[PDB]
From a paper:
KP.2 and KP.3 carry new F456L/R346T and F456L/Q493E mutations on the viral receptor-binding domain (RBD) of the Spike glycoprotein compared to JN.1, respectively. Mutations observed in these lineages, especially F456L and Q493E, are located on the interface between RBD and human ACE2 (hACE2) and are shown to affect the receptor-binding affinity and substantially escape the Class 1 neutralizing antibodies (NAbs). RBD with ACE2, particularly the synergistic effects of F456L and Q493E, we constructed recombinant subunit proteins of JN.1 + Q493E, KP.2 (JN.1 + R346T + F456L) and KP.3 (JN.1 + F456L + Q493E) RBD and determined the variants’ structures in complex with hACE2 at a resolution of 3.30 Å, 3.30 Å, and 3.29 Å, respectively, using Cryo-EM. Consistent with previous reports on earlier SARS-CoV-2 variants, the interacting residues of the three RBDs with hACE2 are comparable, including Y449, N487, Y489, R498, and T500.
Interestingly, while the F456L mutation minimally perturbs the ACE2 affinity under Q493 in the case of KP.2, a 5- to 10-fold increase of ACE2 binding affinity is observed under E493 for KP.3, demonstrating an epistasis effect between L456 and E493. RBD forms two salt bridges with hACE2 H34 and one with K31. Moreover, Y449 binds to hACE2 D38 and Q42 through three H-bonds, and R498 also forms two H-bonds with D38 and Q42, facilitating a more compact contact. RBD harboring an additional F456L, in contrast to JN.1 + Q493E, the L456 adopts the same rotamer orientation as KP. RBD, allowing space for ACE2 K31 to insert. As a result, E493 forms three salt bridges with ACE2 H34 and K31 and avoids electrostatic clash with ACE2 E35 in parallel. The superimposition of JN.1 onto KP. RBD shows pronounced steric clashes between K31 of ACE2 and F456 of RBD, thereby disturbing the binding mode. Thus, F456L could be a prerequisite for the fitness of Q493E. The intermolecular coordination between the 493 site of RBD and K31 of ACE2 is more stable (and thus stronger) with E493 due to the favorable interaction between explicit charges, which elevates the energetic penalty of enlarging the pocket to encapsulate the larger side chain of Phe.
Author numbering:
A (entry chain B): 334 to 482, 484 to 527
B (entry chain A): 19 to 612
The structure:
Amino acid sequence: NLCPFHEVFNATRFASVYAWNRTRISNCVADYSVLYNFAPFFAFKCYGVSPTKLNDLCFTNVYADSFVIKGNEVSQIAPGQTGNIADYNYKLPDDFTGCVIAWNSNKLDSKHSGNYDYWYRSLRKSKLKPFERDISTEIYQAGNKPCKGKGPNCYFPLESYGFRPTYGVGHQPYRVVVLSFELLHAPATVCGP
Amino acid sequence: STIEEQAKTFLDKFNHEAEDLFYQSSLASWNYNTNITEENVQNMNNAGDKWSAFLKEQSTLAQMYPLQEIQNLTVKLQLQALQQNGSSVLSEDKSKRLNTILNTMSTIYSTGKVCNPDNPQECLLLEPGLNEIMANSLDYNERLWAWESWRSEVGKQLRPLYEEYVVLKNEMARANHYEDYGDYWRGDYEVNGVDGYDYSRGQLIEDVEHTFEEIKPLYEHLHAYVRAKLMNAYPSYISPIGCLPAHLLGDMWGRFWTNLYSLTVPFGQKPNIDVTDAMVDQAWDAQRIFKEAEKFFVSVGLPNMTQGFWENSMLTDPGNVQKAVCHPTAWDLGKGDFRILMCTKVTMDDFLTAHHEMGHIQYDMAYAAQPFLLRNGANEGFHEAVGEIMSLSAATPKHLKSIGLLSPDFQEDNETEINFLLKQALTIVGTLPFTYMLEKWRWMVFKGEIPKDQWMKKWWEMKREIVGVVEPVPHDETYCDPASLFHVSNDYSFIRYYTRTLYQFQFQEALCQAAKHEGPLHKCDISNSTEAGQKLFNMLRLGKSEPWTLALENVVGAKNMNVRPLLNYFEPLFTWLKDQNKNSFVGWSTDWSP
Ligand SMILES: *[C@@H]1O[C@H](CO)[C@@H](O)[C@H](O)[C@H]1NC(C)=O
Ligand SMILES: *[C@@H]1O[C@H](CO)[C@@H](O)[C@H](O)[C@H]1NC(C)=O
């Protein structure tokens, strides 16, 4: 069978970094050359399994997360990193055996008047444990008084990533697609020659 | 949750929404300036109204965090820049009156015309006509008539208006927990909260006074030299022991003496160095000038600039259609968007101003990492200082030879750099006494030392004492001569230029001292020197995060304003001036009277 790598990479719409999209991939044959023949990416720094041995191993489950962030915040998609994206939005485990693919997509994810369809969580009471998804638009109580709905010391958590094509590199949208490779004691499911 | 810990969350949401509302406002302003059209003006006005409303709302919301419970220095600085009451401390009627009077002052300075000569059919506009007629003129009568007509048409209409403006601004400053409007203006050269690096407004006054006192001899010698040259040019118009009339000081305002170089050529047989002919001979486009400037900046050590700087920013005149404004400006839109708005021409002046604005752009990229309220120079005199050191480095003949534009066969003789030093002094050291006099007069007018009923007499007496120029005609009390200045009428601080020069010369001396350069200071070049680039970038990346008394030392080595770099920069010029005015009189006296 053919793994749905193309559908993950070719998706017309991409999720937001706070509500990122996870798609388990299994019961197919790995084809990483197809992944290569997609686009000239901006980052391919992929920790753990080497790209050469990608077509020489058998990873039980493949997780293809996908979201849109800034260019500065791509460097926060890596084990042992800190920031707004690596503490509240999307944290990777220290034992990350997968590949983080992240190209530039300002051509499709910009509207010339503010593409406020992409959000990110900037305030949270506690940090985010690895591979945890939190979507709760509850007003954040920064002050010492109970929150009655916005107003002083009560801020909406999620802040939108106002995207425009005129932004310089680093603030333009970046469709990041990490490709985690989890392994268990179950028989090998994803294998490719 | 401590006050210092809630301050930080408010400040974070300010930072995000404010960055969005500035890239919106700055984009609207750029669209207006590039293409002037009614919808563009409406959009810019809407964006500015939204930005002002957001700033007012955030300033009102930030009053709940007192500065006594704030311990972090950066958070305290951001709150101080955000907790300012501004003009909202006045009554609504008083605030509306102040806004209206400022607006009418601006619109009467901008739209003023001189129809007094002959018939009112020929109304001479200030910008195209008055500047052209004041840049060069061989007739005393026309210069005097134009100067007197402009001064009268300004003062006779803005004297009570300026009195009301002064009263309103003083009341606002007093209600703003300050002493007067001059104190409010000086409240930005102020550091308090860190030991060792601290500053006060009175300390600023004393430092300015001491720097001017130790800079007086050089300006006095230059004034004597230019007075002798004008006496040679103008027969029977100046006194040997008296101050020269003000209206012949090149520009009508007398702020800059650059226009007097034509009559004060040290060596007419040796023409000044020019690159226009060699630049057109090489077929240099508007893109090549910026390409070479970026190459110089990279050679220094500063990084390249993105493709968004090249595709978005416009560098050439767009022709008859799509009218724009030819004011060279370095735009920092707010989110990775850096642009320069200028109509580049094939000239030496445009080539140098390209580097001048490109340095501001480099400063913007350097401090882009800082929070929103700390994305500025540590004071208002840092941006222009960096631009000017860029221009000074780019204008050296050795750099011109290195870039390949100048012929290597060219040789340097003492006349060349002596003329260059004289031009620099006319541009730089000739605007320090005027700036200091104007700022001191405004400070004492706002403070109350100068009585309201006695403005013109004290201003002109200060002009004799400090700048050293007499009145072409006696002036009564129904005049507002300082209001004719753009900065005074538009409520702008003027000490920026004094601070800019006194910082730029220290910066250049420190940078080229670390570049392992042996020789004169005026030939210092930062090109192909990574150490000086790193030393400058260390200060550039700071922005307003740390006090200017520390950022100045981080690149120079001193925590205070200094004149010795300025004095020894013009050292060969100083010795030449000393050797020149031997038999001529030294100094000016106020005893002269018409
Ligand atoms: C994949 O995307 C490219 C452009 O991004 C498009 O040309 C191609 O048709 C897509 N493949 C599909 C829709 O199967
Ligand atoms: C994830 O993607 C699926 C389709 O691939 C969509 O139905 C779902 O709403 C998405 N969820 C989020 C949180 O974006």
